């Protein structure tokens, strides 16, 4: 009998594979589309770029859903195929051994935060884990009080396939009450940034078993693991954590188009501030009397939210949220990597500007200054006009000054600018930014000619 502990650990130990490629799920790749479109809006010339933008996400953390429930728990036997990417598991149905399990609640003494399981199944583990909570509660609770660990990730909405290699393919089913509108940022009406929070309180962690076959309970041998599918292709893996609490996925619909709006959140998760949105969210975990899907509010709806599950309440035990998975051969921490391309769609608005020269000596002084204008032909492609200030290659006096008011469609300003001590330079710049307000001034001696670039 002894000898098939032994053999059952040859076979675990025995198989070559490369971790951090098992657990990679590659979406659509596209080949790259830059591509643009111009529009002309008082004060402004705005572009809707659209190009192929790429996410790769590495994440160990996967989320808890009610189609994955039961087949989560501490110790569960699972198979790092293609279910485990859907993050919706496949349990190895088999017999199974003890597993010792610890919980890092606060004031935990001696061995009162190690348990054992003789034949490990969901029901027998959740009643084990939660029978171990409600001790701690009625014994603890009042002294010692647990802070929510927070774990907050966002980003913009870009492709519904975009979403699933952040949060994970199961987005689709739990952001489907976000009705996530996606035809408008393509228009470019609307800004729509996804978050998720994970409000931890308490995590239960398996010990590593002394041995692979630990995990198995009779005199399992190699051959049942084969008929099974346990190989190489798909290695055995088992739910190392699981994470109780609080975890949400919550939408926010924007119209501005500051490249800082994911500033303004970080702001509210402790750089813009001062905005009214439309907030809608879903919620896992609240406390049964108030909670569900919650739409509408403004930001401090928002941030009470994210507060009201600050601490552990203590009227029940907590539900699963989050879980990690380690492989069985060798203990480690497995990662899941999901790749994919986009389209990205982005708004960018370029002001109207206008340039000051400013001309204060008794210096003969000569400017010259280019730049670049876009314009949509007959046909409706991008055009480029070089164009020259008509003040240029003139002799300038004492008291000069003049405006050059540029539109949002000019880019590549150049600014020549030479004097007399023939011709001499005193200042030169390319590519100046069109900022709504820029003067260049000069003053001095001729032999000490000296100048000003000031922005404002």
Same mark, same amino acid.
């Given at each position: 009998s002894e000898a098939a502990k032994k053999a059952l650990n040859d076979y675990i130990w025995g198989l070559q594979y490369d971790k951090l490629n098992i657990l990679t799920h590659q979406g659509e790749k596209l080949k790259n589309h830059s591509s643009r479109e111009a529009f002309h809006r008082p004060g402004e010339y705005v572009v809707i770029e659209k190009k192929k933008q790429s996410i790769s996400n590495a994440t160990s953390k996967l989320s808890v859903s009610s189609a994955n429930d039961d087949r989560i728990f501490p110790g569960a036997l699972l198979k790092a195929?293609?279910?485990?990417?859907?993050?919706?598991?496949?349990?190895?149905?088999?017999?199974? $051994?003890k597993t010792t399990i610890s919980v890092n609640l606060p004031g935990l003494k001696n061995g009162e935060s190690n348990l054992t399981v003789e034949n490990p199944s969901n029901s027998t583990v959740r009643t084990a884990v939660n029978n171990l909570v409600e001790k701690w509660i009625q014994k603890y609770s009042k002294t010692h009080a647990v802070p929510a660990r927070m774990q907050y990730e966002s980003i913009s909405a870009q492709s519904m396939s975009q979403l699933q290699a952040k949060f994970g393919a199961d987005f689709s089913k739990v952001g489907a009450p976000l009705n996530v509108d996606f035809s408008s940022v393509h228009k470019g009406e609307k800004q729509v940034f996804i978050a998720n929070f994970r409000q931890v309180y308490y995590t239960a962690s398996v010990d590593s078993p002394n041995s692979p076959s630990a995990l198995f309970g009779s005199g399992i041998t190699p051959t049942d693991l084969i008929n099974r599918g346990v190989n190489s292709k798909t290695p055995p893996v088992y739910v190392s954590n699981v994470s109780y609490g609080?975890?949400?996925?919550?939408?926010?619909? !924007?119209?501005?188009?500051? !490249?800082?709006?994911?500033?303004?959140?970080?702001?509210?998760?402790?750089?813009?501030?001062?905005?009214?949105?439309?907030?809608?969210?879903?919620?896992? $975990?609240?406390?049964?009397?108030?909670?569900?899907?919650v739409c509408t509010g403004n930001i401090d709806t928002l941030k009470d939210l994210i507060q009201k599950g600050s601490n552990f309440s203590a009227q029940s035990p907590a539900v699963p949220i989050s879980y990690t998975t380690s492989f069985v051969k060798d203990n480690s921490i497995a990662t899941i990597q999901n790749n994919t391309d986009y389209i990205e769609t982005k708004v960018t608005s370029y002001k109207d500007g206008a340039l000051t020269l400013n001309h204060d000596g008794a210096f003969v002084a000569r400017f010259y200054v280019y730049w670049e204008?876009?314009?949509?032909?007959?046909?409706?492609?991008?055009?480029?006009?070089?164009?020259?200030?008509? $003040?240029?290659?003139?002799?300038? $006096?004492?008291?000069?000054?003049? !405006?050059?008011?540029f539109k949002g469609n000019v880019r590549n300003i150049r600014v020549k600018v030479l004097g007399a001590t023939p011709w001499r330079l005193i200042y030169s710049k390319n590519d100046l930014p069109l900022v709504p307000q820029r003067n260049i001034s000069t003053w001095g001696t001729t032999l000490h000619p000296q100048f000003e670039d000031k922005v404002v």
């Open positions: 195929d293609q279910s485990l990417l859907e993050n919706l598991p496949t349990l190895i149905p088999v017999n199974r $051994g609080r975890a949400m996925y919550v939408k926010f619909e !924007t119209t501005s188009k500051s !490249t800082k709006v994911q500033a303004a959140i970080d702001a509210v998760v402790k750089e813009n501030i001062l905005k009214n949105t439309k907030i809608c969210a879903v919620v896992l $975990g609240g406390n049964p009397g108030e909670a569900s899907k204008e876009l314009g949509h032909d007959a046909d409706g492609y991008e055009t480029i006009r070089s164009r020259s200030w008509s $003040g240029n290659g003139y002799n300038r $006096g004492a008291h000069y000054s003049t !405006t050059l008011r």
